[PDB]
Enzyme design. Structure first.
Site, PDB file in Angstrom:
ATOM      1  N   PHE A   1       3.052   3.415   0.703  1.00  0.00           N
ATOM      2  CA  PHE A   1       4.228   3.533   1.565  1.00  0.00           C
ATOM      3  C   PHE A   1       4.439   2.476   2.658  1.00  0.00           C
ATOM      4  O   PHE A   1       5.006   2.774   3.714  1.00  0.00           O
ATOM      5  CB  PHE A   1       4.217   4.962   2.070  1.00  0.00           C
ATOM      6  CG  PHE A   1       3.836   5.960   0.969  1.00  0.00           C
ATOM      7  CD1 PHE A   1       3.170   7.145   1.265  1.00  0.00           C
ATOM      8  CD2 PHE A   1       4.110   5.654  -0.384  1.00  0.00           C
ATOM      9  CE1 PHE A   1       2.775   8.024   0.236  1.00  0.00           C
ATOM     10  CE2 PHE A   1       3.724   6.523  -1.432  1.00  0.00           C
ATOM     11  CZ  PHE A   1       3.055   7.708  -1.121  1.00  0.00           C
TER      12      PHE A   1
ATOM     13  N   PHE B   1       0.808  -1.205   0.000  1.00  0.00           N
ATOM     14  CA  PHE B   1       0.000   0.000   0.000  1.00  0.00           C
ATOM     15  C   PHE B   1       0.841   1.255   0.000  1.00  0.00           C
ATOM     16  O   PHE B   1       2.065   1.208   0.108  1.00  0.00           O
ATOM     17  CB  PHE B   1      -0.951  -0.007   1.213  1.00  0.00           C
ATOM     18  CG  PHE B   1      -0.240  -0.160   2.540  1.00  0.00           C
ATOM     19  CD1 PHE B   1       0.300   0.948   3.190  1.00  0.00           C
ATOM     20  CD2 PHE B   1      -0.038  -1.425   3.094  1.00  0.00           C
ATOM     21  CE1 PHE B   1       1.036   0.794   4.357  1.00  0.00           C
ATOM     22  CE2 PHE B   1       0.694  -1.583   4.258  1.00  0.00           C
ATOM     23  CZ  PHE B   1       1.234  -0.477   4.890  1.00  0.00           C
TER      24      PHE B   1
HETATM   25 CU1  CUA Z   1       5.128   1.668  -3.522  1.00  0.00          CU
HETATM   26 CU2  CUA Z   1       7.017   2.774  -4.756  1.00  0.00          CU
END
Ligand code: CUA
Ligand code: HAS
Ligand code: HEM
Ligand SMILES: CCCCCCCCCO[C@@H]1O[C@H](CO)[C@@H](O)[C@H](O)[C@H]1O
Ligand SMILES: [Cu+2]
Lengths: 557, 33, 166
Positions: free
Chosen positions: C86, C84
């Site tokens: 980050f 997702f």
């Molecule tokens: Cu997730 Cu780059």
């Protein structure tokens, strides 16, 4: 209202200049971000300084978008439109439909401006690949669409030139440059359908608010249908020049007309049906089809393998005529004092490591080692940022004068050599740095200087990236200085704007005829190329379109 | 004049470079398998 | 001279072509080989497995991070990963070396990369689709997951962890 009698006689000369200049300006602006991107991969963070200089820049990624878009898409397309229209025109000594030629320039210009606005405004920081769900401003997609469609007019212009020439030369084989240009543009037409389909069916209605989602897999499948052949679209204009002009600058001749035709014919046939090699790491695409595309990709390498020998042989031949010694004497006999010769030759040198990288990336299972790592950028700067760009820069020495009547002093010629050697040297150092780092799993498209301690094992290669960034920065600055010192002078010998293009003579043989005649059955080969695209993409696209799963867009910048 | 020694030399280097890259990465692939 | 060089070149050209194609076919053979071995597990599943990116972490195999790992065979463990904006779920991912780990990765937002440093696992993660790859770790330790597909401003900080237990 034309002060130049030369332009009244040869109007295509003016339209070509506008394409070139617009192209190099784009090259200069996009290239400014390169040195910073190199330092970044050298673990040094110089962006706050760039941010201080170019305040509108909001991040590493906006700058990377401008870099790829202005350099890989804008500069290259305009260079191609200029070369693959003007050279065939001058070869046939026929005038392109000028209402259409200027129309194609305005489409590129208006499309570029329209897209530039959102880009400069941080409204489309989605990189030059613009992969959904990442959603950019509608003016970006509309601007690109118009910009690219400019090429459809270019295609029409050359096919028209070709048809008109065939009518005034019944039973004659298509001249070489025109032949390259015709199969080139026909190839591009087939290739562009992927992107046109993506923009017309998804991207445009998506950014205008008509639809809320876009299936990511089919969007990138369509993208790569165009995605690969477009780099050949970037390359072949350089190849046309290397086959038909370089031998002359070298003091020799093209040793084989039929070989050059064949290479280009192979490109028309195999450039488009190989996009899955950009999707090896993707789900939802049958592994067998990936293997098939992997095979067709190795075949598309054949044309360049031929090019290597044909060009090398032509260079050796030229070197001998100049008094070439032994196994390496011909090399020292060449005109290393002429930038029109040196720039492309260095480009070809780095193209060896470049092609090797590509052949690796094309081996299906081996791509899992380097996919999305610094190795990929390492690969292509050797292909487009070096060979294509150097050939374009080098050709400014014969092209610029032929279009403006402006001479090139000995000082400019030498400044040119320094720029060429530095750019090449710089690119080679960077290639080593990026490839090394790539094998060390450093990802690409990453502002890693912002996470200093994330890649310690890439210690030494980061050094090479810092060196490249500095070297290339100097080269770039000198190119600007020199380019403008040439476009800003008023010395003007109209006689040299009227000189013919330095096309090389071509050695021909007895067996040529029948082979050359078979290759001239363009309509047949066009249909064949089209059938291959339907066979390599049809099966997969039918299944994807039967199970579309569009998802909502996102803005994460 | 005769046999293209220089050209053959160039494609020899091209050939060797391709092999180092390919075999080199073919090795790493298995090392990471 | 010149017409003599023509025949010679065109002659060695044909030789160069026959050699090149031969070297290419050898590559094609060596690639076929890998497809027959255990190493070919990292090749993403070909069949389409659609899922809704907006309900992935509400209902389904990706909803509860605690039920991510699940023995589906005597030595087979299926891990439902979620890449997702980050980050990776679950973090860390814990599995037993020597066992065949079948990853089934998806995304709730944009495209992400799933690159397990030290291995051949390198698969693109697409919203609305499941990326299914199989792999067997042979060395214990902490393998780092790196996102190699630009996904926004925090992309360079998107890392994950896989702990293969000795
Ligand atoms: Cu997730 Cu780059
Ligand atoms: C113009 C720009 C480009 C060219 C040309 C190019 C050619 C190839 N590429 Fe590529 N490429 C790939 C495979 C190939 C292969 C097999 C070739 C071939 O066509 C190359 C054939 C070349 C040769 C076989 C070498 C011939 C050498 C010659 C002709 C020079 C001889 C020297 C002489 C004559 C001079 C001698 C002089 C003396 C003085 C002695 C693959 C994989 O299968 C990927 C995906 C990687 C991934 O995982 O994402 C890829 C990715 C890219 C990307 C990244 C796209 C993105 O952002 O995601 C770009 C921009 C790019 C550009 C270009 N690429 N490529
Ligand atoms: C001054 C010379 C240049 C330098 C120092 C340079 C440097 C770089 C670096 C370090 C990257 C990696 C960025 C990242 O992965 O985050 C990059 C990417 C790229 N470069 Fe260049 N470059 C230069 C010139 C060019 C030219 C001339 C072209 C094309 C004609 C070009 C096209 C690209 C493209 C297409 C990318 C990929 C962008 C993306 O992944 O979205 N570059 N460059
Ligand atoms: C959106 C469609 C736009 C169609 C525009 C057609 C313009 C007709 C050509 O204009 C050209 O402009 C050049 C400067 O740019 C002049 O040097 C050139 O002599 C002039 O002929
Ligand atoms: Cu490609």
């Amino acid at each position: 209202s034309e002060i130049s009698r030369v332009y009244e006689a040869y109007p295509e000369k003016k339209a070509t200049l506008y394409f070139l200049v617009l192209g190099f300006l784009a090259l200069i602006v996009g290239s400014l971000f390169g040195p910073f991107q190199a330092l970044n991969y050298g673990n040094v963070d110089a962006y706050p300084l760039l941010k201080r200089l170019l305040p509108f820049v909001q991040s590493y990624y906006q700058g990377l978008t401008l870099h790829g878009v202005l350099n890989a898409i804008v500069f290259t397309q305009l260079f191609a439109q200029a070369i693959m229209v003007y050279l065939p025109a001058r070869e046939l000594n026929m005038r392109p439909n000028m209402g259409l030629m200027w129309l194609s320039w305005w489409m590129a210009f208006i499309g570029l401006v329209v897209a530039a606005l959102p880009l400069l405004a941080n409204e489309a920081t989605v990189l030059y690949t613009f992969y959904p769900p990442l959603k950019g401003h509608w003016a970006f997609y509309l601007g690109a669409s118009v910009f690219v469609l400019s090429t459809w007019v270019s295609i029409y212009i050359v096919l028209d030139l070709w048809r008109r020439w065939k009518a005034a030369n019944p039973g004659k084989v298509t001249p070489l440059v025109t032949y390259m240009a015709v199969v080139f543009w026909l190839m591009w037409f087939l290739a562009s359908l992927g992107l046109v389909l993506e923009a017309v069916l998804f991207l445009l209605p998506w950014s205008f608010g008509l639809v809320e989602g876009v299936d990511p897999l089919v969007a990138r499948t369509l993208f790569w249908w165009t995605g690969h052949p477009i780099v050949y679209f970037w390359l072949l204009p350089a190849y046309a020049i290397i086959y038909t002009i370089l031998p002359k600058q070298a003091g020799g001749k093209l040793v084989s007309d039929p070989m050059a035709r064949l290479a280009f014919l192979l490109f028309l046939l195999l450039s488009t049906p190989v996009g899955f090699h950009h999707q090896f790491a993707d789900p939802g695409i049958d592994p067998t089809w990936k293997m098939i595309h992997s095979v067709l990709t190795l075949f598309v390498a054949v044309p360049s393998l031929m090019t290597a020998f044909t060009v090398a042989a032509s260079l050796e031949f030229a070197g001998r005529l100049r008094g070439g010694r032994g196994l390496f004497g011909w090399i020292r006999a060449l005109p290393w004092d002429n930038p029109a010769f040196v720039a492309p030759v260095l480009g070809l040198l780095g193209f060896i490591p470049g092609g090797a990288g590509g052949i690796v990336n094309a081996s299906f299972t081996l791509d899992y080692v380097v996919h999305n790592t610094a190795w990929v950028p390492g690969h292509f700067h050797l292909q487009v940022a070096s060979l294509v760009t150097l050939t374009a820069m080098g050709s400014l020495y014969w092209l610029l004068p032929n279009l403006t009547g402006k001479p090139i002093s000995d000082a400019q010629r030498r400044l040119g050599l320094a720029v060429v050697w530095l750019w090449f040297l710089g690119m080679m150092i960077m290639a080593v740095g990026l490839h090394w780092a790539g094998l060390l799993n450093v990802p690409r498209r990453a502002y890693i200087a912002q996470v200093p301690d994330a890649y310690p094992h890439a210690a030494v290669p980061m050094v090479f990236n810092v060196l490249a960034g500095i070297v290339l920065l100097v080269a770039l600055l000198l190119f600007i200085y020199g380019l403008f010192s040439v476009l800003l002078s008023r010395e003007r010998k109209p006689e040299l704007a009227e000189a013919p293009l330095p096309f090389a003579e071509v050695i021909s043989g007895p067996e040529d005829r029948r082979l050359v005649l078979a290759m001239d059955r363009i309509g047949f080969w066009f249909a064949v190329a089209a059938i291959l695209v339907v066979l390599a993409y049809g099966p997969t696209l039918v299944q994807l379109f039967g199970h579309l799963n569009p998802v909502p867009g996102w803005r994460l910048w | 004049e005769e046999k293209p020694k220089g050209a053959l030399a160039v494609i020899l280097v091209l050939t060797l470079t391709i092999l180092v890259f390919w075999l080199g990465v073919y090795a790493v692939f298995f090392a990471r398998g | 001279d010149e017409h003599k060089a023509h025949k010679a070149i065109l002659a060695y050209e044909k030789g160069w072509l026959a050699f090149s194609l031969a070297m290419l076919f050898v590559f094609i053979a060596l690639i076929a080989y890998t497809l027959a071995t255990h190493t070919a597990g990292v090749i993403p599943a070909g069949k389409l497995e659609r899922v809704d990116p907006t309900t992935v972490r509400q209902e389904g195999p990706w909803a509860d991070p605690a039920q991510a790992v699940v023995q589906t065979g005597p030595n087979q463990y299926t891990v439902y990963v979620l890449a997702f904006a980050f980050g990776y779920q679950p973090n860390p991912i814990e599995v037993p070396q020597g066992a065949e780990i079948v990853f089934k990765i998806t995304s709730p937002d944009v495209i992400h990369g799933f690159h397990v440093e030290g291995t051949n696992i390198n698969v693109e993660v697409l919203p609305g689709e499941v990326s299914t790859v199989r792999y067997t770790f042979k060395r214990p330790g902490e393998y780092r997951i790196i996102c190699n597909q630009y996904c926004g401003l925090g992309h360079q900080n998107m890392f994950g962890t896989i702990v293969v237990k000795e």
